[PDB]
Amino acid sequence: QIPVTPDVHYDIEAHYRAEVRMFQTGQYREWLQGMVAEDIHYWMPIYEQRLTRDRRPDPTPDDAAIYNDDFGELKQRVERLYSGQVWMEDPPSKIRYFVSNVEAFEAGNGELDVLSNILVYRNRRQTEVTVHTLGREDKLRRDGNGFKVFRRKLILDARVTQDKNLYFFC
Amino acid sequence: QIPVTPDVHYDIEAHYRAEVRMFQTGQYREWLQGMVAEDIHYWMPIYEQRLTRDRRPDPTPDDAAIYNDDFGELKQRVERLYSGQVWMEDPPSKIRYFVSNVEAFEAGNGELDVLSNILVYRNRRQTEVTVHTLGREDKLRRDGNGFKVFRRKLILDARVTQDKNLYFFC
Amino acid sequence: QIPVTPDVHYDIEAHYRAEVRMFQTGQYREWLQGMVAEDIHYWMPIYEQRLTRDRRPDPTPDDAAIYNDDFGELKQRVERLYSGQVWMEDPPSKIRYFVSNVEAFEAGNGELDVLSNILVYRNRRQTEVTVHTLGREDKLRRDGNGFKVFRRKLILDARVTQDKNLYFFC
Amino acid sequence: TLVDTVNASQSRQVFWDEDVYALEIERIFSRAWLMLGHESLVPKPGDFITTYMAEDKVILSHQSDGTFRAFINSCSHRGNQICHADSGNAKAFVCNYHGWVFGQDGSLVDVPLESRCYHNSLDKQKLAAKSVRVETYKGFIFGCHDPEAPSLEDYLGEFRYYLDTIWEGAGGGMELLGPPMKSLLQCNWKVPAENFIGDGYHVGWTHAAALSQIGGELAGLAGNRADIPFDDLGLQFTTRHGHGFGVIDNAAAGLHIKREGWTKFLEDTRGEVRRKFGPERERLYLGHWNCSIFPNCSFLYGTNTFKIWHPRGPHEIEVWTYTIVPRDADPATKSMIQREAIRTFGTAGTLESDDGENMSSATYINRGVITRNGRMNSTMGVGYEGPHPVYPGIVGISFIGETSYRGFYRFWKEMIDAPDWASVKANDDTWDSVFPNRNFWNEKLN
Amino acid sequence: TLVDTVNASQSRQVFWDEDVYALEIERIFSRAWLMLGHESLVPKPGDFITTYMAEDKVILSHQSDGTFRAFINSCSHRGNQICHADSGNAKAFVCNYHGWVFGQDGSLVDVPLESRCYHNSLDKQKLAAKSVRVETYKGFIFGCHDPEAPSLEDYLGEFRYYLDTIWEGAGGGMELLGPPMKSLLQCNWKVPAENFIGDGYHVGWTHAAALSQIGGELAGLAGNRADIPFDDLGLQFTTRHGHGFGVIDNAAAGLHIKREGWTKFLEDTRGEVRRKFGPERERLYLGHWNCSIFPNCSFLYGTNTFKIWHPRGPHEIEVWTYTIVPRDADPATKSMIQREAIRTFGTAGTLESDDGENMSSATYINRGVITRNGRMNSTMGVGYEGPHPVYPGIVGISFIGETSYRGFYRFWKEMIDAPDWASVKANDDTWDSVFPNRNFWNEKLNAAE
Amino acid sequence: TLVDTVNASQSRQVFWDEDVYALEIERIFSRAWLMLGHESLVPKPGDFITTYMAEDKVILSHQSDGTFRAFINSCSHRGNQICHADSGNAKAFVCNYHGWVFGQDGSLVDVPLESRCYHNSLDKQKLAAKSVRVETYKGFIFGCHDPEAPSLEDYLGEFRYYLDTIWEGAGGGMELLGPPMKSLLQCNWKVPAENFIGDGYHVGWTHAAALSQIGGELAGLAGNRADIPFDDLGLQFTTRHGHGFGVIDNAAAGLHIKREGWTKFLEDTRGEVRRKFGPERERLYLGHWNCSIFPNCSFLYGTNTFKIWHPRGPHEIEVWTYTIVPRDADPATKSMIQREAIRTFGTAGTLESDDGENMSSATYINRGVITRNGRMNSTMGVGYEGPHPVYPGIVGISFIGETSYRGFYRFWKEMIDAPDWASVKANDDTWDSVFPNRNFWNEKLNAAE
Ligand code: FES
Ligand code: FES
Ligand code: FES
Ligand SMILES: [Fe+3]
Ligand SMILES: [Fe+3]
Ligand SMILES: [Fe+3]
């Protein structure tokens, strides 16, 4: 897989910066419409801790996952953070994303394979603070308005989640 | 609402990196002289936790703020760190900044509206560590071939600050 | 004192992103071969807390350091993660790097002086999480269509390390 | 008084106090049967999982001989954790510090340099990793530290009447799908245990948004409006050893959006349940259950999430979430149930995500001295319950009700007061004297 | 002993020990009047704030009827925190676990499904959120958990003589400006309490660089050198219920750089203060105060920062910082006072930022067994203090001294030692025996002029 | 029983229980001599370091007459830590809160405004920072809090026979190089202590990888092969006050890859060691030691890492790691030893990084009540040990054995059971009765040769 040119790199980073702004400002409908393809698979597998001698395969979409969603399932998830009226989210919890190490590769047929590191800082109420780190593996399509994601795989670094929930998008 | 060219974006990123390095190396006088406009308003509001139903307006500069400074007031703050003998800062505490999600927009008259995520890692003495996240909203103007900030609004993520102080610049 | 051009800047960032990828995926041999020069000095000094009035010089390579290695000694370190069943690393622990504020300067003889901020998040077993922040000061030279590091100085922000070990590369 | 069974209230200290917690560890967790997993998690010989019994790490292993055994996951040399893997297949486990080798039942089977350095003087028979008693009920695997405990069969007791409906059902019963989600939640273990055993009340309030979105059957619950005859719509149950649940009739698949296979499965098997277990239990088979098995296992039957609340002191838990599915369901039906159960009740659950603060706030509010010396009320439906002519145990008239809270805290008190199992067993015939309305159902059903 | 009132020392255990802290919660925080806020924070019917009494969360509400009430922020069903808003306007508060509804006084006013599911068989009278006794003084609102406690006015006692100078003043008194800054600090609550009650001594040492930078009146203090006749420059005061403060003469606005409106207001109003309260209290009205109200509220009158030190166990606090301003000041003055007060003493304060290690180190050094079995000294100026012919309580000769430490710890000891309020009241007339120099002020003043 | 010396087992409670830890603080850390450093760390008049004695912070200072003193790093005013610097040179230390000035021995020598504000009435001689007894052995510096403790020489006791081999050696002895690495490790302080005192057994299992890569002498330990006569290859030693070590013959520089200077230094000095101390000690001089000095100091002689395990409660330590080097080695040799020592055993050590989980898991596994009411076995080699005709104390036949564990826990039990030093001393004649095989070495050595 050939690394993208610096100008393509730029556009990919710009796209991810705008995606993060949508998340941070609660513009989830606009994100689904403008940034996510209708054939999306949005996937966060549960990885167990295994001995190195263990030859079992890595998790597939048929196995346990925290997220394993199509476009309609994402639309469903997004609406919770509208309308609430969800009392834990009155007022909305705060979230801030630090995306780093974006590397893209041309994948044929106009598509891109993109890796990135994500740090997510969350605050709510008076003193509640939680932090998550993840890898992201995307496939992006070019379209008439930039890029849309059609496959997103999120790899959590922590086996045991030190938070009340993982109810945020990446 | 016009996003900047890649060449302008690069210059802004370069400006912010140089600003961070001034903060990290204690060159506060250089920062103030070269990177801050004499018409600066430096502002970090106090945001209370309110119910969504609450219809009171957001904080303005007439309300409680942790910072609410003009240039002369920043100069005063600077000199405590730059010249004072403050025993907690013998030797200087350590600070490291991670600036992410820089998005700039051409405003009128050569001015820029610039948005930024900031993660601040602080260490002192033997085992003390504190960590802050915030949003930054700047108005910059070109100061060829660099920039100077003339409005800076800093949005703290945490309601209750888990640190001795917030005596650092962003 | 000459900062690099934007194109050279991009190339240094892309080099660093590839480096990070190699660390995160355990490709240490490939790193040593392709990204590290044979005249490398890889150095992580121990900085003590001293009063400002102290006039003693900064640590040199003849003083205590956590790392103080030539290429052969780096090779030795790299194999511990290969040529050994190390039971703490069965399976390997997870590490994720957030590199920011990369600033590069043309240093003479075609060599580059490069500053960067590093945030390193590590997870292992069920609930273990440790976090490190460092400054990195490199001298790089051009090698083919990329770079190799020939001097790396790592400046830890914490006096007392809050982790079992510092057995990771930067 | 920590629990008042007469007036149905509890001290706030039960969610907060360190000494109360220590007594729980002694008199509940070191005495009771605790959920370890299911045969489906360790299906082949040599298969194991690592898990917890309260704060003790244990290894559960499918033995070469087909039995299931468990042991404390701590080396008999210097104490190190024997195995760190979540799951795998192992003929032996080796401690990583010095290489002592443990068998599938925790026996010390070999030590490096046994002849050379120990001079064959090491008495390996006395150095087994501590065994834990293991018993199975319909494929579900429980452990117990107390050799005086009743059989698992007797600990479930009359609760088996109910569990047989679903864990036998049309004949295939149910199983667990892993790997589990694992998360820390800063609450006492009893807050979620009581929420799942009996908290129909909260559903329409806390989850009003989720129910309005999902639409369909359960949607009516949203807002807890006064005009609905909830008592025409379900029941609540409690038993001698604290186990209980509420049921919403005809709502098993109510929170699933894609449910064709699960809905069809129930349609296809309900007739066999009617035959084997009677119409009274066919009713349950088609209902949605919120259930806790005393002390710290809970599940939703219908939505099909399955949870163990592992205590980490009085103010934290580690929550493990599996999916529970019928064994005889087609693989695709099992996968769809798993996706819907995780989307509603997993770590990013559209419903579960709503509950975190409910649980932690009920706990941590008691940081204040004036606050924790207050009490909590669980009197909802008191007197609208009693022995039933068909259903064993004690039955309340609605899934919105606190019958099962009352049974839970009654048995919690009984256990905390009893110095041993013999004392508990002494009370077997009189346990339900605190439900004074003995003619309620006869008079009501007439 | 924990506190030696004869020789003016304290055990280091008072900053560290868990059982001592537990006795404080029971015998001070569960007993005393604690600062909840001010009418200005809850000014209109229905207006509420959430706050702390020690480690208990409380709601304070301006009732439809114009009175103020408070209650524990914990639902009577399963205990859930009722309200998470910092402030607002509400006729009711709804517990969001199951929807129990609580009135502005904490009454249980609605229970969802009461008929259907409770069968109207819930006694809502026994299920009010727990009430907190509230009384007010000059708009400042306090709470108390002990029904045997004296009135707030008797609890302030002779300290009202001082407070009336500034909380009535020319007629308009003072009020609080929020929202508050909130921050955690890893220290015992008493370290900041004592620092504000009486620590003139640290100012010239710790804040030397801030003082020398500002220049002006207070800048003379920088460095703590012998040059200055400090005692000519101010006084220190302590009272029966531990309340105390230091005053620097004619220095009220000395730390404000932009201070036109504030200085003008003092000049404009000092006359009426002289007429009402006399020359001796006009002196105080123009002075800079560093004050603590026993146990855990503090303020600087002049600089105008106002602090509550909410304990979180013995080795942490949550500090809430408000601004205190005269009600009758112009809005532009009020906003300027707020800016100056926050720039000096807020979370990024140019002075306050100097003190955080002074507070935490004094606490956490006691991790060591040998260390904590030591003691602390507060003997500065002992015997240069006593009852005074004009000013009530006990007066010491300088803002640099420890009269107010001694007063603070004496009362702390009295309360910690007392099984009930009756036993405290039983020593109202002999509290100040530990200050033996009865004719100190007679002799000082006679011999003077 | 917490320690069974008859059957050589211990309760897991010793790694976990908070009340056991409190007893250790009282009966071990406040009783014994603890390692502070070495003259080389404070080599000139005025030089100082900050360090710990268990959880107490101390200052160690080289006085003007070349003696050393130490004192608790806490101000006698309000308790503030006096000095925050790791090291430096100071004729006085000034507390940052109010500026009280402490001398090199912790005496309170000056206070700001002593005349003006204290009226010269502060009794400064009663307000010294608390002294700690300081004694030195061959340049190594120890402290003790217990007035009744025996001399440092008597506490080392028969262990000095061993230490003189290397801390005198050919005449130059050894010194420490700093600054130290400092890290937190979530383990009980005893797990590393025992690991270093006697755990030859883990080396070939845990460090097999590191060993295979280094090659040479110690590489043959990898995988712990049953065909090797380990007892031909070393010995293990324990002594009356808990100190012990294992020795691997002829392997001093075995983990060093660049070792020309160190290997030549040993070759050039062994002759004089044989002369002074006998071939029995020349053997030790050329060997690799793993050593603990009771309670919480450990070192590897040969690899030359030197560790102090400072407790932070029963479930945490702060590890300080120095390099130990011969004084008479060339500067180039000392530098090379430090690089090799750090590369194997520092915070990023190629060996040390393997051991963290072994330390922490043995501790935290005891979070579970059923687990912590279990026991730990240390029976390896029992009965293959006894008094020796040449070597003092109790000697075991292999560096792979638990002789030194048994000695360590025997002394721990003795200290914990003893209300004072007088009770300990009363066991001096019968301390080793728990090693029943009294004729083991006489039969063995006679059947040999
Ligand atoms: S601790 Fe398990 S083999 Fe030694
Ligand atoms: S906990 Fe408040 S309504 Fe149930
Ligand atoms: S605390 Fe040290 S001088 Fe006051
Ligand atoms: Fe729920
Ligand atoms: Fe101060
Ligand atoms: Fe080791």
- CA distance linking residue F266 with residue F81, whole number of Å: 44
Cα distances from F406 to residues A126, F198, F391, in angstroms, run: 52, 9, 18
The 3-class secondary structure across F84-110, one letter per residue, is: CCCEEECCEEECCCCCCEEECCCCEEE
Which amino acid would we find at residue F236? Q
Do F383 and F440 have their domain in common?
yes
| Phi, psi for A136 (deg, rounded to 5) | -120, 135
Provide the strand spans (E) within chain B. 2-3, 36-45, 65-69, 94-106, 111-124, 128-143, 146-156
Q: Which chains does C contact via 3+ CB–CB distances below 8 A? A: A, B, D, F
| Phi, psi for C160 (deg, rounded to 5) | -100, 115
Residue F344 gets the label, from left (phi > 0), alpha (psi -120 to 50) or beta, of alpha
Q: Which residues hold their Cβ within 5 A of ligand 4, which is an ion?
A: D 355
Do E68 and E8 have their domain in common?
no
Q: Which chains does F contact via 3+ CB–CB distances below 8 A? A: B, C, D, E
- Contact assessment for residue F55 and residue F145, using Cβ atoms and an 8 Å cutoff: no
Residues of F tagged active-site:
98, 199, 202, 207, 355
Task: Residue F159: count other Cβ atoms within 10 Å of its Cβ.
Answer: 23
Which amino acid would we find at residue A78? V
- Contact assessment for residue D304 and residue D339, using Cβ atoms and an 8 Å cutoff: no
- Contact assessment for residue F379 and residue F8, using Cβ atoms and an 8 Å cutoff: yes
Final residue before a domain boundary, out of F150, F175, F200: F150
- CA distance linking residue D145 with residue D201, whole number of Å: 35
Q: Which of F194, F206, F254, F165 is closest to F403 using CA atoms?
A: F194
- CA distance linking residue C125 with residue C143, whole number of Å: 39
* The pair of three-digit structure tokens given for residue F136, joined into one six-digit string: 């030195």
User: Judging by beta carbons within 10 Å of its beta carbon (0-12, 13-18, 19+), is residue F392 exposed, middle or buried?
Assistant: middle
B127/C52 Cβ within 8 A:
no
Residue with CA nearest ligand 3 atom 4: F98
The answer to the question of whether A9 is labelled as a binding residue is no
Residue of D nearest to C91 (CA): D85
Q: How far is the CA of E194 from the centre of ligand 3 (A)?
A: 13
Q: Do chains B and E touch (3 or more CB pairs under 8 A)?
A: yes
C119/A119 Cβ within 8 A:
yes
* The pair of three-digit structure tokens given for residue F264, joined into one six-digit string: 């030549």
Do D291 and D217 have their domain in common?
yes
Closest CB to E98 among D191, D205, D375 = D205
Q: Which residues hold their Cβ within 5 A of ligand 5, which is an ion?
A: E 355
Report the CATH number that the domain containing residue F15 is assigned in CATH: 3.90.380.10
- CA distance linking residue D414 with residue E171, whole number of Å: 65
Binding residues of D for [2Fe-2S] cluster: 75, 77-78, 95, 98, 100
D369/E55 Cβ within 8 A:
yes
The SS3 call for residue C169 is coil
Closest CB to E213 among B46, B76, B161 = B76
Task: Residue E420: count other Cβ atoms within 10 Å of its Cβ.
Answer: 13
- Contact assessment for residue C160 and residue F183, using Cβ atoms and an 8 Å cutoff: yes
Do F164 and F306 have their domain in common?
yes
Do F263 and F118 have their domain in common?
no
Helices H / strands E in chain B, number of each: 3, 7
- Contact assessment for residue F340 and residue F332, using Cβ atoms and an 8 Å cutoff: no
The catalytically annotated residue of E202, E231, E328, E354 is E202
The answer to whether the CB of F118 is under 6 A from ligand 3 is: no
D365 to chain E, any CB pair closer than 8 A? The answer is yes
Q: Which domains does chain B have, with CATH numbers?
A: 1-170 (3.10.450.50)
The catalytically annotated residue of D56, D164, D355, D432 is D355
Do F121 and F47 have their domain in common?
yes
* The pair of three-digit structure tokens given for residue D79, joined into one six-digit string: 């104490």
A130 to chain D, any CB pair closer than 8 A? The answer is no
For a ligand 1 pocket test, name from D57, D94, D95 the mutation site with the most ligand atoms within 8 angstroms of its C-beta: D95
Place of tokens 């050799």: D147
| Phi, psi for D144 (deg, rounded to 5) | -155, 135
- CA distance linking residue F206 with residue D97, whole number of Å: 6
* The pair of three-digit structure tokens given for residue E319, joined into one six-digit string: 């500090």
The SS3 call for residue E344 is helix
Q: Which atom of ligand 3 is nearest to the CA of F76?
A: 2
Do E114 and E262 have their domain in common?
no
Q: Which of F98, F52, F50 is closest to F78 using CA atoms?
A: F98
For residue F329, what is the DSSP state?
S
- CA distance linking residue B91 with residue C71, whole number of Å: 35
* The pair of three-digit structure tokens given for residue F221, joined into one six-digit string: 């330990």
Q: How far is the CA of F410 from the centre of ligand 2 (A)?
A: 57
Residues in CB range of E229: below 8 A, 6 or more apart? none
Angle ∠(D167,D170,D173) on CA atoms, nearest 5: 25
- Contact assessment for residue F79 and residue F98, using Cβ atoms and an 8 Å cutoff: no
Residue with CA nearest ligand 1 atom 1: D78
Domain interval for residue F349: 1-29+151-449
Do D367 and D330 have their domain in common?
yes
Angle ∠(D354,D358,D362) on CA atoms, nearest 5: 170
User: Does residue D4 carry a catalytic annotation?
Assistant: no
For residue B93, what is the DSSP state?
P
Please name the residue ranges forming H helices in D215-330. Answer: 260-277, 279-285
Q: Which of D104, D25, D112, D44 is closest to D69 using CA atoms?
A: D104
Q: Do chains E and C touch (3 or more CB pairs under 8 A)?
A: no
Q: Do chains A and F touch (3 or more CB pairs under 8 A)?
A: no
- Contact assessment for residue F78 and residue E195, using Cβ atoms and an 8 Å cutoff: no
Place of tokens 């000014």: E43
Which residues are paired to C2 by β-bridges?
Answer: C106
The SS3 call for residue A3 is strand
Q: Which atom of ligand 3 is nearest to the CA of F75?
A: 2
- CA distance linking residue E291 with residue E294, whole number of Å: 10
Do D84 and D58 have their domain in common?
yes
Cα distances from D256 to residues A74, D147, D286, D347, F15, in angstroms, run: 15, 42, 14, 17, 49
User: Does residue D199 carry a catalytic annotation?
Assistant: yes
Breaks (C-N over 2.5 A) in chain C follow: none
Q: Which atom of ligand 3 is nearest to the CA of F80?
A: 1
* The pair of three-digit structure tokens given for residue E12, joined into one six-digit string: 């280091």
Breaks (C-N over 2.5 A) in chain D follow: none
For a ligand 1 pocket test, name from D57, D74, D80 the mutation site with the most ligand atoms within 8 angstroms of its C-beta: D80
- CA distance linking residue B16 with residue B35, whole number of Å: 9
Q: How far is the CA of E203 from the centre of ligand 5 (A)?
A: 6
- CA distance linking residue D257 with residue D218, whole number of Å: 12
Q: Mutate one of D84, D97, D310 to test the C interface: name it (highest C CB count within 10 A).
A: D84
Residues in CB range of E212: below 8 A, 6 or more apart? B84, E219, E222, E223
Helix axes E160-167, E260-277, angle to 10 degrees: 130
Residue of F nearest to D115 (CA): F226
Q: How far is the CA of F401 from the centre of ligand 6 (A)?
A: 15
The catalytically annotated residue of E47, E56, E105, E199 is E199
- CA distance linking residue D338 with residue D343, whole number of Å: 8
The end-to-end CA distance of chain B, in Å, is 25
- Contact assessment for residue F301 and residue F307, using Cβ atoms and an 8 Å cutoff: no
The catalytically annotated residue of E47, E56, E105, E355 is E355
Do D358 and D369 have their domain in common?
yes
The SS3 call for residue F176 is strand
Q: How far is the CA of D436 from the centre of ligand 2 (A)?
A: 26
* The pair of three-digit structure tokens given for residue F372, joined into one six-digit string: 């912590």
* The pair of three-digit structure tokens given for residue F399, joined into one six-digit string: 């560096």
- CA distance linking residue D158 with residue D391, whole number of Å: 9
For residue A5, what is the DSSP state?
P
* Pairing mode of beta strands A36-45, A146-156: parallel
- Contact assessment for residue E322 and residue E360, using Cβ atoms and an 8 Å cutoff: no
C126 to chain D, any CB pair closer than 8 A? The answer is yes
For a ligand 3 pocket test, name from F71, F75, F108 the mutation site with the most ligand atoms within 8 angstroms of its C-beta: F75
- CA distance linking residue D232 with residue D188, whole number of Å: 33
Chain D and chain E share a number of CB contacts under 8 A equal to 110
Residues in CB range of C66: below 8 A, 6 or more apart? C44, C45, C46, C156, C166, F181, F342, F346, F347, F348
D381/E118 Cβ within 8 A:
yes
Question: ω before A6 within 30° of 0 (cis)?
Answer: no
Closest CB to F230 among D74, D77, D116 = D116
Do D128 and D183 have their domain in common?
no
* The pair of three-digit structure tokens given for residue C119, joined into one six-digit string: 């945030």
- Which chain D residues are closer than 8 Å to E56 by Cβ? 367-371
Final residue before a domain boundary, out of E120, E150, E180: E150
- Contact assessment for residue F7 and residue F409, using Cβ atoms and an 8 Å cutoff: no
Number of domains in chain F: 2
Report the CATH number that the domain containing residue F89 is assigned in CATH: 2.102.10.10
Do D4 and D126 have their domain in common?
no
Question: ω before E192 within 30° of 0 (cis)?
Answer: no
* Determination approach: X-ray
Residues in CB range of E419: below 8 A, 6 or more apart? none
Which amino acid would we find at residue B73? E
Q: Which of E176, E346, E302 is closest to B73 using CA atoms?
A: E346
Task: Order the strands of the E56-62 sheet from edge to edge.
Answer: E34-38, E140-144, E131-137, E68-72, E56-62, E47-53, E87-89
Final residue before a domain boundary, out of D111, D132, D150: D150
The answer to whether the CB of F102 is under 6 A from ligand 3 is: no
- Rounded to the nearest 10°, the torsion over CA C53, C57, C58, C63 is -130
